Symmetry: C3
Subunit: 606 residues, 3 copies
């Protein structure tokens, strides 16, 4: 006579299957396997970069400031009518006999200006040899020497225009700088020089560039310089180039072009540079600098490189030094040092290696080193793409390694679990089966197979319980589970059955049991429970009350949340530009406006 | 009489529950679901950047080196008193009638210097028209032409000051360069020119900038140039600007400002630029370059951009060329090309797309393209923040995708597992229950629920076994499990029970069994085993001996270890700066020290 | 008489074990635990960088363009013989009495040139005081003023050489710029000045650098400037430096060196800068800029820094302003502001913090702030290594956090699973055991242990079934499972047994069963099934037919695929260089070729 308290569930009549429909538990699947593991070859690496450093060398300038001053005299004053200042070369001979020999210098200048030979006499007086005194010391200045420090104008002869000459033999060490092709260089003064620093006579150095005549250059063999301050003769000789331009006479110690120059610079040395082979490329991993390189499989011809001899010396010099401190007692060099080109344009020198362990493998890999086998290379300033490559790769693996491993433990588990479901199905088919089919049913074991038949739904408001459970027709023998009556649909007849497990509606009431004392049980009725006390209904219940426990194992996985990368520079191109103390462009844009701003440019009088 | 060998464990008396405390297995939880999946719209993209390239064009300089030389003669020598060198413009008329027509040039100069008109005659001789010969070929030099190559000084008249003039009409092609606003430009020589290259008369070009008078500029219409070397007349005419500065006469072919100029440069072309919508922004993914862009939802007005017409031509020119080689047979353009602004300042042109597949969706998305709808933009040099954005995002997903998927397989598993625990509990409640409650207990099935009662601990040193298992009161009927006696506490009475499963202390000995031959068994006693042989104790044991097998499935997960990112530049700002051959600042800092170092600056004589 | 249809499997005879070999289920392992969780200390941070900005200040130039022109007159024309132009300083006195007082200027120049005092008179006429008019307005130009705008040449006296003087007192405001050590600076004009801007007399400013005499510098105390355009006297006084170089007289308002200068620049302000302690270093995480810093544990002495006072003011000024808008009501400053040095060279100022929550912890951490306790620092331009560090770390954790958590849920699961396998083994040992041992066997429970004995293989082509299952010797009592006969090897005798579960060959046929109606079953025979209908063979079968269901739970894990990072720059070093309008190097390389190209350099006549 008693209904249900909560109807947020559904009942099901489970008529035994006939065998019509038959299923089977899916057999174990085949589990994936971890890759054979990447093979990393050890090897010392050296990375060269496009040398943007100008070739630098030292030199010395020899010239004479020639200044002629004209003056007009007044009754109680005077004025410069014109100061015509000029700068003349110190003839080759004077540079050797006077300056280099005795630290002296002629009081005259003698050179060619405007297709003509002029001659200046200091103070318009007879010629003399004057000693060279050091120039005034100044903050951050190369060494400088000169003849006199006082100019010379005409002696007073009132109401007249007189002329006065001033000669100052100046010599100072400067810094010259040349760039590829090295067919011309510049001094610290700004004076350009249109000859190769490597020009000369010895050893084919005469095919170097010169835009000058032949009587201007004079290479001196076996040359000992006499310092102009300490006055000491050089202990060793040099081959000395001496060029004489219309404005000055440069000189410098001649050296060969190939050894003194190189279009590449040793940039990064790497102890451990892992080399691997991925789909027709080599990945040079450097854990140290966090950088991975991508190259081709075949080497790169050094001979194809324009002026790149330092590379050889530079590289080997390092691979030896490293092999020493490190590989001297653990590894061995494999094949000769190899050279490959990387994306962006970084030249990489490599020396494959093997530990004393795998000594037995030398033979094979040695061949693999040999199977690897006039312009200039352009390199990028940004090495981020590689560190991205490195960082991404480094992570691409771990994630896939761990997640890959996980995948396998899983497959093995599901297959491993089958064992249990198999046993469980025999025990409680109606329960195990349902889950598996996805729908609520009833099933039986036709040997080694299952045969299922669906269970018909029944609303809860169509279910009644009997206030008792005792049998009178068999006293001392009651039912193990509560008695109930139910309805199909709403207007259909009323049926009676015995309450089963998990709201099954059993058509039979053969689940009998010899009555006993201390009989107390809870039976899942509706969306909750029904507590019968001593073979008699007591009251229903919600599932909330009954203390809940868990067969589930928890796992708290949050997701990785978004993040914005703000554009960030340490120094903007604006700062970088501003940093410069002087700006040529600005200086000219300003200075060249002078006559527009401060003067009249078109006005003419007659 | 026999104790235990190992006492690193604990015993438990498990008195049947009364039903007082009752629990229930937690019901299946609800499993999360993978997001609906991100919607990526295909589209061809073009990315423009702040054009830092100066506007560049070609021109030609017309001037005359005017040099007056004064000389003093001696008995056996001579000297330059003053060489006053000047540089004069070639008047507009002469540039057309003499130079352009016949490759000739006047032997005179005629111009205004210092608010006055001066006239120089070459060699101080009557005027002439002289032909223009090519200048001496030099390494890397623009074309140059001139009149004469020999200077001119006065003929000898001993003991006198004489005057000599030298005129050299020089013409040479130079490279001019202008920057925004393009109201002035510079020549390859360093000479500034304070007029817009776009100045002129035609089509409002007269509102361009000029800091000069009107008689200095002269635009020539229908202009055919006669090459000075090949002597050939141009086949096509140009509008020719001719400005005459106090120092020289520039000239160049006039062109419009808007088409010839643009404040942006087509930088990167992208075939596949995925566009997505995340919380009020568009993420432009380029797999190719590894770069993701962040923009607003509404477009950006090109009209708002200052001088940006090339952008239009540039963009479309590309989206067509790409759509051709690629999208010609697979996709279709959606709406008009759209323009959005990205962080950092990269202008992005986009052309949304759809494959022939989803042709039925054109209508809707077309509107979504239209719903999208005078200064200059500043762009950063660093595109790393984006490649970080890209790289991070690319990984942020996979990890969350896979780990997300995992989470779900888990929830489903635990719920799936419940089925088993349910069956297992009926079988062996005391075992299944314990694990679940967390503590060791005993339990019974009060229908569809569990009722538990704790088990009291018993030290191992308080446990004794009987050397036998045979019953005399029922011969041919022994016990299935060993006999034992135990103690509560240490000083308490001694109790007798039957050994149960996993060290349970059963209060009853009703586990009887008809004796049999070949009876041999191991029973978990203490921290090990007790091997009874033929219903009689034989000896205890440690668990070590018994071959162990595993129900567990292994998973080896290591963690991702730290890594340091060393600061790494390919070229330091120091190198970058050094690379430059000449440094204006250095040159001036040095040169301007001259008089301090090598001369006397305050000394005065009278 | 009937064989098998499919033989892609194997049969096994499973003779009961004797107890010889005995095993045991591995006991639960100990599960790892998540780390105690990283402790992050909140704190406001400010990051300074190597200041590459030149020190900038304003000044004013005072000079006089002195121009002497000489002309020769002809019958119908004239010419400049020589224009000797010079530039003279405006004496200290004139700068105060004439220019600053009345906006006037002397019509004469009076200075020292070439160790001699010259005197120029404008127009060669008596001295005058001339007013200073503004210079012609020009695009983007500092203020300029001058005396006259018309030059002056000699009046016509035909057939003669006459002389004319021109003096133009010019004054213009320029921008000076100095760099460390700030012992010299330059003007906007390009004129260098070899004195420290901080030189003076007051407060030890006389130990600053000067390469000049003492009569050239003149610091004026209590100085009010009278604007030359508005003519207004300054409302406040300044200490005014006035240096007089041979070419011009600079002047500027003197200021102290330490406050006006600093070798570092406040670069990035960070509200939330997480500070953590990892193996002897601090990691400064800024979520905002995506950047993590690495420093030492002990602070860095500011006193050790050369000229770094602005840092103090700059830093605190910010930490206060932030603490205001934010920490004013939630946190509290902990200890004094601390300073540490980071890799690459970024100075970081930090102010540790605690929320009002953990107020009780102030005491301890305060000490930890104190336990933390003349050159210049070099900073890198690339901040990518840090954003890599940040990005990598940020991900290194999540992956390890989640995957770590996973590992634990696993261990707990396997141990949790043991419970089930334990129950399952009792039920079906032959099944549960096999899986566990890895090989197919049969086993029995010797109490609390297992005893196994292998099962011998039997080819399928050696297996026959009986067309029926009914017993005649016991009518109304048949077998539950099909009858079969089999062979060991190929030539061995024929044995008879009863079909068991999963192709076991039972030696006994005691699995009898009282015959029943509606008997229909499938028995796994060979690689498929055998369907007996009513105790009689009907036909074999393949496993394909029988509807398959799954006990396995799916998990779809793909791997993270490779990706190439193309080298990518926004502006190449080539563009960066090109961008510059003028290039000094180019200008000189070109200009200095002049005489080679356009003239004769060696030819001499006599
Ligand atoms: C790497 O080397 C191992 C043995 O050293 C070898 O078994 C394996 O084949 C190699 N890796 C690959 C991908 O072939
Ligand atoms: C490697 O060789 C291929 C084929 O010549 C070429 O396309 C590719 O650019 C090369 N890679 C590098 C790093 O230059
Ligand atoms: C995670 O789930 C919740 C917190 O979100 C909590 O109830 C549970 O105990 C947590 N599990 C573990 C072990 O982290
Ligand atoms: C993406 O498109 C699909 C169908 O094309 C749609 O079902 C889904 O709603 C869209 N994504 C989101 C997040 O709405
Ligand atoms: C997008 O619009 C918002 C609102 O005007 C603005 O704050 C933000 O700066 C814009 N984003 C970009 C990329 O400029
Ligand atoms: C991982 O665990 C250990 C090695 O740490 C080893 O005993 C076991 O076999 C490994 N499992 C697998 C399958 O990697
Ligand atoms: C971090 O702080 C917590 C309490 O605030 C403490 O228990 C823990 O020991 C600290 N972390 C470490 C690694 O010691
Ligand atoms: C920190 O101190 C150690 C020991 O003096 C030193 O080697 C290291 O370079 C320092 N770190 C930094 C950031 O300079
Ligand atoms: C994943 O496995 C396959 C697709 O590869 C499919 O049959 C299955 O349904 C998928 N499982 C889930 C839930 O993603
Ligand atoms: O470029 C010439 C080369 O020698 C230098 O850069 C390095 O030594
Ligand atoms: O033309 C030179 C002018 O611009 C100033 O530099 C003079 O000091
Ligand atoms: O800046 C002017 C523009 O035309 C060039 O940069 C590219 O063509
Ligand atoms: O003032 C010019 C001096 O610095 C040298 O460049 C001369 O060669
Ligand atoms: O370098 C001097 C300093 O004061 C400036 O860079 C910032 O104010
Ligand atoms: O020597 C100056 C020449 O190179 C040109 O700049 C003249 O206009
Ligand atoms: Na003489
Ligand atoms: Na004449
Ligand atoms: Na006079």
């Amino acid at each position: 006579d008693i209904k249900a308290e909560n109807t947020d569930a559904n009942f099901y009549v489970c008529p035994p299957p006939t065998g019509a429909t038959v299923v089977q538990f899916e057999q174990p699947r085949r589990c994936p396997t971890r890759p054979e593991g990447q093979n990393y070859t050890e090897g010392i690496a050296v990375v060269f970069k496009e040398n943007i450093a100008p070739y630098k060398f030292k030199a010395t300038m020899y010239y004479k400031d020639v200044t002629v001053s004209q003056v007009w005299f007044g009754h109680r004053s005077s004025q410069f009518m014109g100061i015509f200042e000029d700068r003349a070369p110190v003839p080759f001979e004077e540079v050797i006999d006077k300056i280099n020999a005795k630290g002296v210098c002629r009081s005259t200048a003698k050179y060619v200006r405007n297709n003509l030979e002029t001659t200046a006499f200091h103070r318009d007086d007879h010629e003399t040899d004057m000693e060279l005194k050091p120039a005034n010391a100044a903050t951050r200045t190369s060494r400088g020497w000169h003849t006199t420090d006082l100019k010379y104008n005409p002696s007073r002869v009132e109401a007249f225009h007189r002329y006065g000459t001033t000669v100052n033999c100046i010599v100072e060490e400067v810094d010259a700088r040349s760039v590829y092709p090295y067919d011309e260089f510049v001094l610290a003064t700004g004076d350009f020089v249109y000859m190769s620093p490597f020009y000369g006579y010895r050893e084919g150095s005469h095919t170097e560039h010169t835009s000058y005549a032949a009587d201007r250059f004079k290479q001196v063999d076996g040359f000992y310089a006499r310092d102009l301050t300490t006055k000491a003769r050089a202990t060793a000789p040099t081959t000395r180039n001496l060029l004489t331009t219309p404005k000055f006479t440069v000189a410098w110690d001649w050296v060969p072009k190939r050894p003194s120059v190189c279009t590449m610079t040793k940039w990064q040395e790497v102890d451990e540079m892992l080399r691997s082979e991925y789909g027709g490329s080599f990945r040079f991993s450097s854990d140290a600098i966090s950088t991975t390189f991508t190259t081709n499989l075949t080497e790169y011809p050094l001979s194809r490189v324009d002026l790149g001899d330092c590379i050889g010396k530079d590289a080997r010099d390092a691979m030896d030094r490293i092999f020493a401190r490190r590989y001297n007692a653990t590894h061995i060099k494999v094949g000769q040092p190899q050279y490959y080109l990387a994306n962006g344009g970084f030249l990489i020198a490599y020396q494959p290696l093997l530990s004393n362990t795998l000594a037995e493998l030398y033979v094979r890999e040695h061949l693999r080193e040999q199977s690897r086998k006039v312009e200039r290379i352009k390199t990028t300033s940004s090495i981020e793409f590689a560190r991205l490559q490195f960082t991404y790769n480094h992570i691409q693996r771990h994630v896939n390694d761990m997640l890959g491993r996980v995948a396998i433990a899983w497959c093995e588990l599901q297959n491993h679990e089958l064992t249990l479901w198999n046993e469980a199905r025999k025990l409680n088919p109606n329960a195990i089966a349902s889950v598996t089919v996805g729908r609520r049913v009833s099933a039986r074991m036709l040997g080694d197979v299952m045969a299922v038949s669906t269970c018909v739904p029944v609303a809860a408001d169509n279910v009644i319980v009997q206030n008792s459970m005792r049998i009178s027709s068999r006293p001392g023998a009651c039912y193990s589970r509560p008695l109930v009556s139910f309805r199909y649909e709403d207007q259909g007849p009323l049926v009676e059955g015995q309450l089963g497990e998990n709201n099954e509606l059993r058509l039979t009431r053969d689940a009998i049991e010899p009555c006993t004392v201390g009989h107390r049980r809870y039976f899942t009725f509706g969306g909750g429970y029904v507590y019968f006390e001593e073979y008699a209904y007591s009251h229903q219940l919600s599932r909330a009350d009954i203390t809940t426990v868990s067969t589930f194992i928890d796992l708290n996985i949050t997701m990785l949340e978004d993040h914005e990368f703000v554009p960030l520079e340490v120094y903007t191109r604006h700062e970088i530009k501003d940093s410069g103390l002087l700006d040529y462009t600005e200086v000219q844009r300003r200075n060249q406006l002078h006559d527009l701003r401060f003067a009249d440019i078109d006005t003419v009088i007659h």
